[PDB]
Amino acid sequence: PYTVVYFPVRGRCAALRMLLADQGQSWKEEVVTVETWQEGSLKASCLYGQLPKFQDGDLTLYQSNTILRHLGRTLGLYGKDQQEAALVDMVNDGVEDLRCKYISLIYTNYEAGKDDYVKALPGQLKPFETLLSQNQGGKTFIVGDQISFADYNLLDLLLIHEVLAPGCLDAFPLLSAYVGRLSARPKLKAFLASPEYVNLPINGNGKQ
Amino acid sequence: PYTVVYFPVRGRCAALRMLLADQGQSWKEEVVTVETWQEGSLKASCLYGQLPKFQDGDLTLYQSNTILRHLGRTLGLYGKDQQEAALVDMVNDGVEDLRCKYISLIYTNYEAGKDDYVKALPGQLKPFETLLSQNQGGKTFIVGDQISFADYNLLDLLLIHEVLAPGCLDAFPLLSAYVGRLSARPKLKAFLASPEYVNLPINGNGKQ
Ligand SMILES: CCCCCCSC[C@H](NC(=O)CC[C@H]([NH3+])C(=O)O)C(=O)NCC(=O)O
Ligand SMILES: CCCCCCSC[C@H](NC(=O)CC[C@H]([NH3+])C(=O)O)C(=O)NCC(=O)O
């Protein structure tokens, strides 16, 4: 079945977990502590020496976006055709770019860089609002009329940004309604409210 | 048909161009100068305010990896099945991670960081050598027995790293043979030797 191997944080596993939960999939969580990681064996066995590590049967995967694409490809959450598939990729790559900036702020210079980051935030969120406005008035999904792995990844990006900069979505009606709508999906809503999600820190250094 | 809109550098368009050329595809190059970019209109119209911008008919794409995946999907360079597709993604995501480090060095701190970067290089290249050793002895491609978009992306990564750190591949026999083999492919070889590739700088700040 499915097994996600990761540190006890939401981090880069938050989106894929929301996906599995919303899709009614069952999975096993193999939690790796900082202590165990510092031992060295697991790290050495990891392709790029990092987590998350994912297992689907005897298929062992690394790279969070590879896991998302795999699940999207196998579960039918990758658009209706090649054109939509490309659009889904364009969204996910954009989500990834901002996530990298977020991760850098959180772990590299939270104190000194937070103000500048928050000031620049609107311009970084704007593209996703525009994408929504061009897809059935932002009433459905980020691409097409069916959910894709990029939706879960974007949802997480928006959720963690609300915590970082409360009210950042206020100027973006489509993104706000989008977060509420997706968060209201029955299985996702239950997951987001569960201790499994709630009692896990967003990041590993206690910053958010 | 195909049109790539980018600055006059190889940068993030090198791999996709090698792909198009090796695949015998025709494309148009719309070169954007720093002057024209500084004008602002094109930038404002770009989804994430950046280039490359790609056009496949009326399908307008952004994000270099989205372009690579699109071309890999439409041209049959994405593995033979879902399992291989996931492996192709794992490789490309790894290539992307190192490319980000490379881009940071080149544009952020070449002088002060080059030594540390080059020292860390072997450990960053090792994963691709290992992948190669696990696939038919590294005699064919990075994933499976047919070329994929990840091959072209990895090839470029290796090529630019050879310029940055001459001899870095000497410690990785499979990777060295791989670069020579792929570079020897008729259409690619002609492309790499052409002024269209040769007379373009690798990066935009004159560093390499
Ligand atoms: C400790 C609690 C906080 C953990 C932070 C999240 S894990 C960070 C890091 N992993 C990554 O950055 C994964 C990046 C990879 N590109 C992906 O997308 O999965 C890691 O394994 N780092 C370990 C290492 O490289 O040694
Ligand atoms: C000037 C000659 C050198 C050009 C260097 C490469 S272009 C750099 C930058 N674009 C990107 O970094 C693209 C990143 C994007 N994630 C992708 O993968 O395509 C850009 O458009 N920057 C312009 C901007 O953001 O204003």
PDB file of N, CA and C in Angstrom, chain A residues 18-78:
ATOM      1  N   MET A  18      -2.846  15.493   2.489  1.00  0.00           N
ATOM      2  CA  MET A  18      -4.189  16.030   2.263  1.00  0.00           C
ATOM      3  C   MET A  18      -4.800  15.307   1.071  1.00  0.00           C
ATOM      4  N   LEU A  19      -3.969  15.051   0.060  1.00  0.00           N
ATOM      5  CA  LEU A  19      -4.388  14.357  -1.156  1.00  0.00           C
ATOM      6  C   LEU A  19      -4.877  12.951  -0.823  1.00  0.00           C
ATOM      7  N   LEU A  20      -4.030  12.178  -0.152  1.00  0.00           N
ATOM      8  CA  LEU A  20      -4.383  10.815   0.227  1.00  0.00           C
ATOM      9  C   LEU A  20      -5.673  10.777   1.041  1.00  0.00           C
ATOM     10  N   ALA A  21      -5.767  11.653   2.044  1.00  0.00           N
ATOM     11  CA  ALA A  21      -6.947  11.724   2.903  1.00  0.00           C
ATOM     12  C   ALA A  21      -8.203  12.096   2.117  1.00  0.00           C
ATOM     13  N   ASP A  22      -8.127  13.157   1.325  1.00  0.00           N
ATOM     14  CA  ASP A  22      -9.279  13.587   0.552  1.00  0.00           C
ATOM     15  C   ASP A  22      -9.689  12.535  -0.475  1.00  0.00           C
ATOM     16  N   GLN A  23      -8.724  11.746  -0.945  1.00  0.00           N
ATOM     17  CA  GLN A  23      -8.994  10.696  -1.923  1.00  0.00           C
ATOM     18  C   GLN A  23      -9.393   9.363  -1.287  1.00  0.00           C
ATOM     19  N   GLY A  24      -9.514   9.342   0.038  1.00  0.00           N
ATOM     20  CA  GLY A  24      -9.908   8.134   0.745  1.00  0.00           C
ATOM     21  C   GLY A  24      -8.880   7.015   0.720  1.00  0.00           C
ATOM     22  N   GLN A  25      -7.614   7.369   0.544  1.00  0.00           N
ATOM     23  CA  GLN A  25      -6.554   6.374   0.499  1.00  0.00           C
ATOM     24  C   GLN A  25      -6.005   6.102   1.893  1.00  0.00           C
ATOM     25  N   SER A  26      -5.531   4.882   2.105  1.00  0.00           N
ATOM     26  CA  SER A  26      -4.962   4.520   3.395  1.00  0.00           C
ATOM     27  C   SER A  26      -3.459   4.536   3.249  1.00  0.00           C
ATOM     28  N   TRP A  27      -2.787   4.975   4.299  1.00  0.00           N
ATOM     29  CA  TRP A  27      -1.339   5.014   4.271  1.00  0.00           C
ATOM     30  C   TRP A  27      -0.769   4.865   5.662  1.00  0.00           C
ATOM     31  N   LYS A  28       0.492   4.469   5.709  1.00  0.00           N
ATOM     32  CA  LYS A  28       1.222   4.270   6.946  1.00  0.00           C
ATOM     33  C   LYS A  28       2.223   5.409   7.099  1.00  0.00           C
ATOM     34  N   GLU A  29       2.376   5.896   8.323  1.00  0.00           N
ATOM     35  CA  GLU A  29       3.320   6.968   8.626  1.00  0.00           C
ATOM     36  C   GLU A  29       4.522   6.403   9.370  1.00  0.00           C
ATOM     37  N   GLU A  30       5.708   6.526   8.783  1.00  0.00           N
ATOM     38  CA  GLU A  30       6.932   6.074   9.436  1.00  0.00           C
ATOM     39  C   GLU A  30       7.649   7.350   9.855  1.00  0.00           C
ATOM     40  N   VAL A  31       7.518   7.689  11.130  1.00  0.00           N
ATOM     41  CA  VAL A  31       8.114   8.900  11.665  1.00  0.00           C
ATOM     42  C   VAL A  31       9.588   8.727  12.000  1.00  0.00           C
ATOM     43  N   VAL A  32      10.413   9.619  11.462  1.00  0.00           N
ATOM     44  CA  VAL A  32      11.848   9.595  11.694  1.00  0.00           C
ATOM     45  C   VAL A  32      12.207  10.762  12.595  1.00  0.00           C
ATOM     46  N   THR A  33      12.819  10.467  13.737  1.00  0.00           N
ATOM     47  CA  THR A  33      13.213  11.520  14.667  1.00  0.00           C
ATOM     48  C   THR A  33      14.564  12.088  14.273  1.00  0.00           C
ATOM     49  N   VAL A  34      14.852  13.300  14.741  1.00  0.00           N
ATOM     50  CA  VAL A  34      16.122  13.954  14.449  1.00  0.00           C
ATOM     51  C   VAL A  34      17.266  13.091  14.967  1.00  0.00           C
ATOM     52  N   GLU A  35      17.038  12.446  16.110  1.00  0.00           N
ATOM     53  CA  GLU A  35      18.034  11.573  16.729  1.00  0.00           C
ATOM     54  C   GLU A  35      18.382  10.431  15.764  1.00  0.00           C
ATOM     55  N   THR A  36      17.356   9.694  15.350  1.00  0.00           N
ATOM     56  CA  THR A  36      17.511   8.574  14.428  1.00  0.00           C
ATOM     57  C   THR A  36      18.173   9.014  13.114  1.00  0.00           C
ATOM     58  N   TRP A  37      17.784  10.184  12.619  1.00  0.00           N
ATOM     59  CA  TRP A  37      18.343  10.702  11.381  1.00  0.00           C
ATOM     60  C   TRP A  37      19.839  10.962  11.542  1.00  0.00           C
ATOM     61  N   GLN A  38      20.213  11.542  12.680  1.00  0.00           N
ATOM     62  CA  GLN A  38      21.605  11.855  12.962  1.00  0.00           C
ATOM     63  C   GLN A  38      22.481  10.614  13.083  1.00  0.00           C
ATOM     64  N   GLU A  39      21.847   9.449  13.217  1.00  0.00           N
ATOM     65  CA  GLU A  39      22.584   8.199  13.303  1.00  0.00           C
ATOM     66  C   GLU A  39      23.295   7.985  11.961  1.00  0.00           C
ATOM     67  N   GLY A  40      22.615   8.313  10.858  1.00  0.00           N
ATOM     68  CA  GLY A  40      23.237   8.198   9.547  1.00  0.00           C
ATOM     69  C   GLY A  40      22.840   7.122   8.553  1.00  0.00           C
ATOM     70  N   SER A  41      22.447   5.943   9.020  1.00  0.00           N
ATOM     71  CA  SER A  41      22.092   4.858   8.105  1.00  0.00           C
ATOM     72  C   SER A  41      20.947   5.152   7.135  1.00  0.00           C
ATOM     73  N   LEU A  42      19.832   5.672   7.646  1.00  0.00           N
ATOM     74  CA  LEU A  42      18.678   5.978   6.802  1.00  0.00           C
ATOM     75  C   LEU A  42      19.075   7.009   5.752  1.00  0.00           C
ATOM     76  N   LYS A  43      19.694   8.096   6.201  1.00  0.00           N
ATOM     77  CA  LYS A  43      20.135   9.160   5.307  1.00  0.00           C
ATOM     78  C   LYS A  43      20.985   8.606   4.170  1.00  0.00           C
ATOM     79  N   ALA A  44      21.976   7.793   4.522  1.00  0.00           N
ATOM     80  CA  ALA A  44      22.871   7.188   3.542  1.00  0.00           C
ATOM     81  C   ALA A  44      22.114   6.358   2.499  1.00  0.00           C
ATOM     82  N   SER A  45      21.036   5.713   2.923  1.00  0.00           N
ATOM     83  CA  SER A  45      20.254   4.887   2.010  1.00  0.00           C
ATOM     84  C   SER A  45      19.278   5.675   1.135  1.00  0.00           C
ATOM     85  N   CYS A  46      19.052   6.947   1.470  1.00  0.00           N
ATOM     86  CA  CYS A  46      18.138   7.798   0.707  1.00  0.00           C
ATOM     87  C   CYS A  46      18.839   8.300  -0.551  1.00  0.00           C
ATOM     88  N   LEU A  47      18.172   8.189  -1.701  1.00  0.00           N
ATOM     89  CA  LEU A  47      18.748   8.617  -2.986  1.00  0.00           C
ATOM     90  C   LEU A  47      19.503   9.941  -2.960  1.00  0.00           C
ATOM     91  N   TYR A  48      18.837  10.982  -2.467  1.00  0.00           N
ATOM     92  CA  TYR A  48      19.427  12.312  -2.380  1.00  0.00           C
ATOM     93  C   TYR A  48      19.741  12.652  -0.916  1.00  0.00           C
ATOM     94  N   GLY A  49      19.823  11.618  -0.077  1.00  0.00           N
ATOM     95  CA  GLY A  49      20.116  11.792   1.335  1.00  0.00           C
ATOM     96  C   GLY A  49      19.130  12.646   2.109  1.00  0.00           C
ATOM     97  N   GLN A  50      17.881  12.688   1.653  1.00  0.00           N
ATOM     98  CA  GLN A  50      16.842  13.481   2.301  1.00  0.00           C
ATOM     99  C   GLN A  50      15.498  12.768   2.316  1.00  0.00           C
ATOM    100  N   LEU A  51      14.589  13.294   3.133  1.00  0.00           N
ATOM    101  CA  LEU A  51      13.227  12.787   3.254  1.00  0.00           C
ATOM    102  C   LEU A  51      12.369  13.940   2.721  1.00  0.00           C
ATOM    103  N   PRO A  52      11.106  13.672   2.357  1.00  0.00           N
ATOM    104  CA  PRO A  52      10.378  12.402   2.388  1.00  0.00           C
ATOM    105  C   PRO A  52      10.802  11.277   1.450  1.00  0.00           C
ATOM    106  N   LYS A  53      10.496  10.076   1.911  1.00  0.00           N
ATOM    107  CA  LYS A  53      10.726   8.835   1.195  1.00  0.00           C
ATOM    108  C   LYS A  53       9.306   8.277   1.130  1.00  0.00           C
ATOM    109  N   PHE A  54       8.929   7.727  -0.009  1.00  0.00           N
ATOM    110  CA  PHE A  54       7.575   7.212  -0.201  1.00  0.00           C
ATOM    111  C   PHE A  54       7.608   5.799  -0.766  1.00  0.00           C
ATOM    112  N   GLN A  55       6.686   4.965  -0.313  1.00  0.00           N
ATOM    113  CA  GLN A  55       6.627   3.606  -0.806  1.00  0.00           C
ATOM    114  C   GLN A  55       5.221   3.260  -1.264  1.00  0.00           C
ATOM    115  N   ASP A  56       5.131   2.794  -2.504  1.00  0.00           N
ATOM    116  CA  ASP A  56       3.877   2.356  -3.108  1.00  0.00           C
ATOM    117  C   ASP A  56       4.186   0.919  -3.530  1.00  0.00           C
ATOM    118  N   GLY A  57       3.881  -0.048  -2.670  1.00  0.00           N
ATOM    119  CA  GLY A  57       4.188  -1.428  -3.016  1.00  0.00           C
ATOM    120  C   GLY A  57       5.703  -1.504  -2.974  1.00  0.00           C
ATOM    121  N   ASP A  58       6.332  -2.091  -3.991  1.00  0.00           N
ATOM    122  CA  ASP A  58       7.796  -2.169  -4.010  1.00  0.00           C
ATOM    123  C   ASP A  58       8.449  -0.980  -4.729  1.00  0.00           C
ATOM    124  N   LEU A  59       7.647   0.042  -5.044  1.00  0.00           N
ATOM    125  CA  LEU A  59       8.137   1.255  -5.710  1.00  0.00           C
ATOM    126  C   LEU A  59       8.531   2.214  -4.588  1.00  0.00           C
ATOM    127  N   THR A  60       9.810   2.566  -4.520  1.00  0.00           N
ATOM    128  CA  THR A  60      10.322   3.494  -3.515  1.00  0.00           C
ATOM    129  C   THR A  60      10.643   4.809  -4.224  1.00  0.00           C
ATOM    130  N   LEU A  61      10.009   5.884  -3.759  1.00  0.00           N
ATOM    131  CA  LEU A  61      10.182   7.207  -4.343  1.00  0.00           C
ATOM    132  C   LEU A  61      10.777   8.222  -3.379  1.00  0.00           C
ATOM    133  N   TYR A  62      11.419   9.238  -3.948  1.00  0.00           N
ATOM    134  CA  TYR A  62      11.999  10.351  -3.204  1.00  0.00           C
ATOM    135  C   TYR A  62      11.524  11.584  -3.959  1.00  0.00           C
ATOM    136  N   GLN A  63      11.618  12.746  -3.319  1.00  0.00           N
ATOM    137  CA  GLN A  63      11.204  14.036  -3.879  1.00  0.00           C
ATOM    138  C   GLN A  63       9.696  14.223  -3.732  1.00  0.00           C
ATOM    139  N   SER A  64       9.301  15.174  -2.889  1.00  0.00           N
ATOM    140  CA  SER A  64       7.893  15.456  -2.631  1.00  0.00           C
ATOM    141  C   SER A  64       7.038  15.671  -3.882  1.00  0.00           C
ATOM    142  N   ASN A  65       7.549  16.398  -4.871  1.00  0.00           N
ATOM    143  CA  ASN A  65       6.777  16.640  -6.097  1.00  0.00           C
ATOM    144  C   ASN A  65       6.659  15.381  -6.963  1.00  0.00           C
ATOM    145  N   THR A  66       7.634  14.480  -6.849  1.00  0.00           N
ATOM    146  CA  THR A  66       7.583  13.221  -7.581  1.00  0.00           C
ATOM    147  C   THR A  66       6.442  12.401  -6.966  1.00  0.00           C
ATOM    148  N   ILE A  67       6.331  12.443  -5.639  1.00  0.00           N
ATOM    149  CA  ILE A  67       5.281  11.715  -4.940  1.00  0.00           C
ATOM    150  C   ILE A  67       3.924  12.283  -5.344  1.00  0.00           C
ATOM    151  N   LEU A  68       3.813  13.610  -5.352  1.00  0.00           N
ATOM    152  CA  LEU A  68       2.555  14.250  -5.748  1.00  0.00           C
ATOM    153  C   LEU A  68       2.170  13.876  -7.183  1.00  0.00           C
ATOM    154  N   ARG A  69       3.118  13.963  -8.117  1.00  0.00           N
ATOM    155  CA  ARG A  69       2.832  13.622  -9.515  1.00  0.00           C
ATOM    156  C   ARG A  69       2.457  12.158  -9.695  1.00  0.00           C
ATOM    157  N   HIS A  70       3.116  11.289  -8.935  1.00  0.00           N
ATOM    158  CA  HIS A  70       2.846   9.861  -9.000  1.00  0.00           C
ATOM    159  C   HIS A  70       1.414   9.585  -8.567  1.00  0.00           C
ATOM    160  N   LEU A  71       1.022  10.146  -7.433  1.00  0.00           N
ATOM    161  CA  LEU A  71      -0.333   9.974  -6.912  1.00  0.00           C
ATOM    162  C   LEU A  71      -1.337  10.615  -7.867  1.00  0.00           C
ATOM    163  N   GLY A  72      -0.983  11.766  -8.429  1.00  0.00           N
ATOM    164  CA  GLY A  72      -1.885  12.428  -9.356  1.00  0.00           C
ATOM    165  C   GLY A  72      -2.064  11.619 -10.622  1.00  0.00           C
ATOM    166  N   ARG A  73      -0.969  11.023 -11.079  1.00  0.00           N
ATOM    167  CA  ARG A  73      -0.963  10.226 -12.297  1.00  0.00           C
ATOM    168  C   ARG A  73      -1.728   8.923 -12.119  1.00  0.00           C
ATOM    169  N   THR A  74      -1.511   8.246 -10.997  1.00  0.00           N
ATOM    170  CA  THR A  74      -2.183   6.977 -10.713  1.00  0.00           C
ATOM    171  C   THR A  74      -3.628   7.091 -10.208  1.00  0.00           C
ATOM    172  N   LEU A  75      -3.974   8.191  -9.531  1.00  0.00           N
ATOM    173  CA  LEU A  75      -5.326   8.421  -8.996  1.00  0.00           C
ATOM    174  C   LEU A  75      -6.235   9.297  -9.889  1.00  0.00           C
ATOM    175  N   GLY A  76      -5.729   9.710 -11.045  1.00  0.00           N
ATOM    176  CA  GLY A  76      -6.515  10.534 -11.949  1.00  0.00           C
ATOM    177  C   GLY A  76      -6.707  11.974 -11.496  1.00  0.00           C
ATOM    178  N   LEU A  77      -5.655  12.568 -10.933  1.00  0.00           N
ATOM    179  CA  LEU A  77      -5.702  13.949 -10.458  1.00  0.00           C
ATOM    180  C   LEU A  77      -4.613  14.717 -11.202  1.00  0.00           C
ATOM    181  N   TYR A  78      -4.637  14.630 -12.533  1.00  0.00           N
ATOM    182  CA  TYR A  78      -3.631  15.273 -13.376  1.00  0.00           C
ATOM    183  C   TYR A  78      -4.247  15.887 -14.640  1.00  0.00           C
TER     184      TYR A  78
END
